[PDB]
Amino acid sequence: DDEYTKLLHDGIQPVAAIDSNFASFTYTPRSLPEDDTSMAILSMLQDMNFINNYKIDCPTLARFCLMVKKGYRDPPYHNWMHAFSVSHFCYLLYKNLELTNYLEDIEIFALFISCMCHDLDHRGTNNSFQVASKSVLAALYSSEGSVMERHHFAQAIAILNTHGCNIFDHFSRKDYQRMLDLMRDIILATDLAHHLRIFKDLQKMAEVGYDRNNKQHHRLLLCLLMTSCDLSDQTKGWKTTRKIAELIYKEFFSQGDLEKAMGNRPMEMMDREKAYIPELQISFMEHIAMPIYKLLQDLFPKAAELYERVASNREHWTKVSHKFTIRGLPSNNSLDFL
Amino acid sequence: QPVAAIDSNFASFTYTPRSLPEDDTSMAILSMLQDMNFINNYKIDCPTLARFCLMVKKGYRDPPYHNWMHAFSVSHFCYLLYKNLELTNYLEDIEIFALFISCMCHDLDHRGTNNSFQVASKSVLAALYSSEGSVMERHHFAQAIAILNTHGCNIFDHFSRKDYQRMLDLMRDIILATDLAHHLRIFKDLQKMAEVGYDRNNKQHHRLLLCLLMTSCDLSDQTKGWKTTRKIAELIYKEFFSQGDLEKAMGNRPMEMMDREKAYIPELQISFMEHIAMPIYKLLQDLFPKAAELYERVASNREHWTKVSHKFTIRGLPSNNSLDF
Ligand SMILES: COc1ccc(Cc2nn3c([C@@H](CCCc4ccccc4)[C@@H](C)O)nc(C)c3c(=O)[nH]2)cc1OC
Ligand SMILES: COc1ccc(Cc2nn3c([C@@H](CCCc4ccccc4)[C@@H](C)O)nc(C)c3c(=O)[nH]2)cc1OC
Ligand SMILES: [Mg+2]
Ligand SMILES: [Mg+2]
Numbered sequence: 001d002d003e004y005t006k007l008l009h010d011g012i013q014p015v016a017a018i019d020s021n022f023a024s025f026t027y028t029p030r031s032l033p034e035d036d037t038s039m040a041i042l043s044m045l046q047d048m049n050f051i052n053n054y055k056i057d058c059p060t061l062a063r064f065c066l067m068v069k070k071g072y073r074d075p076p077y078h079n080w081m082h083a084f085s086v087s088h089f090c091y092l093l094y095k096n097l098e099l100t101n102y103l104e105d106i107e108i109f110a111l112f113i114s115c116m117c118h119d120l121d122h123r124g125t126n127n128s129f130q131v132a133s134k135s136v137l138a139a140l141y142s143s144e145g146s147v148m149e150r151h152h153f154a155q156a157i158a159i160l161n162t163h164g165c166n167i168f169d170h171f172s173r174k175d176y177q178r179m180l181d182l183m184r185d186i187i188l189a190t191d192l193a194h195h196l197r198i199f200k201d202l203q204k205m206a207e208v209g210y211d212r213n214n215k216q217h218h219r220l221l222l223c224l225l226m227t228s229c230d231l232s233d234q235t236k237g238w239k240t241t242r243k244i245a246e247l248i249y250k251e252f253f254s255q256g257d258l259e260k261a262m263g264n265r266p267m268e269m270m271d272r273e274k275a276y277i278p279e280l281q282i283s284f285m286e287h288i289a290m291p292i293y294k295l296l297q298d299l300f301p302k303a304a305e306l307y308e309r310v311a312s313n314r315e316h317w318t319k320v321s322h323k324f325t326i327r328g329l330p331s332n333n334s335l336d337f338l
Numbered sequence: 339q340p341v342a343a344i345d346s347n348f349a350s351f352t353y354t355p356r357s358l359p360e361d362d363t364s365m366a367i368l369s370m371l372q373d374m375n376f377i378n379n380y381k382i383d384c385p386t387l388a389r390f391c392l393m394v395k396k397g398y399r400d401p402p403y404h405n406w407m408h409a410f411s412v413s414h415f416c417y418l419l420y421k422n423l424e425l426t427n428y429l430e431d432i433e434i435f436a437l438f439i440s441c442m443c444h445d446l447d448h449r450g451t452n453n454s455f456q457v458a459s460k461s462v463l464a465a466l467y468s469s470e471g472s473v474m475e476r477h478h479f480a481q482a483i484a485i486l487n488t489h490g491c492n493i494f495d496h497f498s499r500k501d502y503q504r505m506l507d508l509m510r511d512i513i514l515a516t517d518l519a520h521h522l523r524i525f526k527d528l529q530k531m532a533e534v535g536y537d538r539n540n541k542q543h544h545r546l547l548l549c550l551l552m553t554s555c556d557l558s559d560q561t562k563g564w565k566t567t568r569k570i571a572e573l574i575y576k577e578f579f580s581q582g583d584l585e586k587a588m589g590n591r592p593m594e595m596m597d598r599e600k601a602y603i604p605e606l607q608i609s610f611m612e613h614i615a616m617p618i619y620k621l622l623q624d625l626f627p628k629a630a631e632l633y634e635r636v637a638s639n640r641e642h643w644t645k646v647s648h649k650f651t652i653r654g655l656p657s658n659n660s661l662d663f
């Protein structure tokens with residue numbers, strides 16, 4: 001009630017007022033208090049001129065932002081602060097990379113909105129868990145795959161179909177259909193299996209050179225950009241990436257505990273008795289995150305620093321891995337842990 | 339107090355002497371000496387023996403491992419060998435008595451540091467003994483002489499000149515034998531004697547057997563259950579790392595096993611068990627088929643270190659759910 005009232009009547013605060021470094025790749029959006037994030041979303045939308053350009057109703061946009069935020073639960077990693085930080089990176093790509101020379105205005109808008117919605121109602125477990133636990137979400141979507149991603153998309157649509165929240169409701173039939181198709185494609189691209197399926201096509205696109213007149217290049221670029229936002233925690237400083245690791249493994253390990261309770265053997269990365277965090281993170285950096293940011297660098301020369309930071313963080317896991325071995329005694333001078 | 343009134347399992351190799359309250363240890367020493375009939379057979383004066391025993395206990399300091407409870411545990415194992423191995427078939431009674439007394443006195447006034455550290459820090463003990471080697475072991479012996487020559491503590495004061503001299507010489511050889519350098523020097527000789535067969539009428543065999551038994555008592559914590567060998571490892575490494583910290587402050591570089599930043603406990607303990615402890619209990623087993631269970635416990639304890647080694651690598655998160663370490 002009161003949150004909506006202040007967003008609506010206080011006016012959209014200037015983006016520069018959030019932090020002097022807010023538009024830099026070195027800014028860490030997790031630094032912003034959660035209570036200030038809904039206004040920051042409106043400030044970013046305004047700074048990208050989407051509110052004016054698409055003549056978005058302000059009461060409707062306020063209601064939509066609050067409803068999207070309210071649509072996240074609170075597991076350790078897949079919560080609203082993740083969606084907010086993913087959306088922020090999308091803003092950073094816009095401000096720093098000149099996306100308008102590559103993408104249509106409506107595609108950029110859809111990317112940002114998709115970022116806000118892309119993990120809606122996440123329950124802290126992955127696609128395989130849905131299927132193994134015979135969840136309602138799997139009853140609905142398992143035959144199509146990307147179970148959680150389909151749910152996230154369905155949740156975004158349900159918000160738009162809530163009276164008072166359809167920020168697109170004045171769009172023409174064609175523009176409305178375009179927006180919803182984009183949101184579908186972008187949200188589904190956050191599944192790893194999807195990314196692995198298109199990786200060679202992404203390589204081929206970077207090799208031949210981006211063609212702005214090629215519809216398929218637009219679609220491929222949107223997928224790559226979405227994935228670069230989803231993984232953007234890795235482009236920050238060491239301290240950020242370390243904290244994020246903690247949150248991700250806490251969540252992964254909770255899942256593994258539930259799998260064990262159902263009589264299943266969890267994947268090693270979900271198994272708190274077998275997971276060795278440094279190797280797992282080095283592998284993620286080397287085999288998944290680094291190639292994504294190397295691709296981004298191939299397409300946007302100004303994205304070079306991003307790849308350099310992810311590479312630097314990968315190096316830091318190597319340097320710190322020796323500390324995971326217990327030399328001497330533990331701090332309590334006891335071998336009670338056996 | 340008869341030994342059977344202390345615990346029904348007191349004379350068993352399964353008994354853990356460190357279970358006995360420290361306040362009761364002096365009485366258990368008397369009970370053990372009574373059970374071996376040493377007091378009656380050499381006509382020891384009982385108040386003199388009581389005063390001696392309390393002086394010995396008091397002459398130990400309180401580092402984590404080399405304290406009175408170590409000396410008590412070592413001397414209890416000596417008693418266990420007497421009871422379970424029937425030592426009187428192999429050794430003279432006086433050599434048995436000497437061994438037990440040596441076990442009580444063998445680490446007197448230990449400072450929780452090794453010989454190298456005494457020499458490196460230029461302590462008075464190093465000034466006195468470094469030229470002859472075995473610095474701490476010479477001090478332990480000189481402390482024991484000092485006690486015997488304290489008024490009312492000379493348990494050997496009625497002995498014949500011959501027996502008195504024999505006791506002095508045995509205590510010296512046995513305490514000096516507690517040095518690891520000495521043990522490795524005579525190890526081939528120990529193997530030789532075990533190969534050809536122990537000779538009850540060869541005086542050199544008696545000397546060698548006495549050395550081997552002493553080291554077998556000094557390491558006896560490893561012949562107990564896993565819980566005991568785990569606790570004792572904690573004590574040993576707390577003591578070692580404390581010396582290593584001191585060496586680092588003096589500008590020196592500790593051996594790896596005393597460097598808390600470098601030491602990997604499972605590898606060190608496995609190495610100790612495999613290359614030092616097991617060969618000793620194997621020898622003991624070659625000479626006494628009854629000591630077979632001791633070797634077996636040691637080898638089993640060795641295997642347990644390698645089954646728990648993986649726990650020294652942090653998998654998953656720490657308990658606090660944080661990577662703040
Ligand atoms: C070797 O394979 C992995 C190793 C480690 C992880 C854990 C992990 N997951 N992770 C994630 C995602 C998985 C992202 C998968 C992905 C999907 C599409 C495109 C690229 C990657 C978790 C939270 O679900 N985001 C980040 C920044 C990380 C991260 O730093 N680590 C996940 C792994 O595979 C999914
Ligand atoms: C690879 O070499 C070692 C590895 C580990 C140790 C530490 C250690 N020492 N230790 C000791 C003694 C050293 C015993 C040395 C010895 C002397 C005579 C005959 C055999 C061994 C420490 C406390 O000084 N007793 C025991 C039961 C242990 C023990 O379990 N571990 C010592 C080591 O060499 C001395
Ligand atoms: Mg997701
Ligand atoms: Mg000693």
Ligand SMILES: [Zn+2]
Binds near residue numbers: 082086118119190230
């Ligand atoms: Zn996500």
Ligand SMILES: [Zn+2]
Binds near residue numbers: 408412516
């Ligand atoms: Zn000792």
